Amino acid sequence: KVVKPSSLNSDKIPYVAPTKKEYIELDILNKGWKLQSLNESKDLLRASF
Amino acid sequence: MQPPYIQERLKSLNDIETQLCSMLQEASQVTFIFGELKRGNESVKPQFENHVKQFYERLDKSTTQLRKEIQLLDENVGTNKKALGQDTEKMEEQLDLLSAILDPSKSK
Numbered sequence: 164k165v166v167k168p169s170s171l172n173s174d175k176i177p178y179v180a181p182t183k184k185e186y187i188e189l190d191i192l193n194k195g196w197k198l199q200s201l202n203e204s205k206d207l208l209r210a211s212f
Numbered sequence: 213m214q215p216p217y218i219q220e221r222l223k224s225l226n227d228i229e230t231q232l233c234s235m236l237q238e239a240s241q242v243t244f245i246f247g248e249l250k251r252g253n254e255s256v257k258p259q260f261e262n263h264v265k266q267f268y269e270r271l272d273k274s275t276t277q278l279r280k281e282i283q284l285l286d287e288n289v290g291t292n293k294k295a296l297g298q299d300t301e302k303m304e305e306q307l308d309l310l311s312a313i314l315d316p317s318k319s320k
Binding site for chain 2: 198201202205208209212
């Protein structure tokens, strides 16, 4: 009822030029959240056991 | 009481679930130790090998013994009945009571 649906149309945008800046931090911080997940994994398993 | 064979069968089964409980407990300690191993202290590193080896050897032989029990089930096949004599034994005891009634020197 809001609108006749033709809303989403294909479009093109270029990929941002890569560098050392963001991937290394992205992956080390992913390491951080997965070390977190390992910690809560161990804690939950200990509580369950 | 039950014949002995059933007695050692139930003892072996009880040993089986106690071994399973020990396996679960050792899983708990190995999960515990891996956490600090990931933390970064290498002192408890030697204990890790021992814990893993004991965990695996506890997991294996328990299942092996249970397999032996299930195998025993295979050859144990072929290897109110009491009522057939029940009245008789009742009969016996009743007459015994009469004897106690019949002799006044034993009613003390």
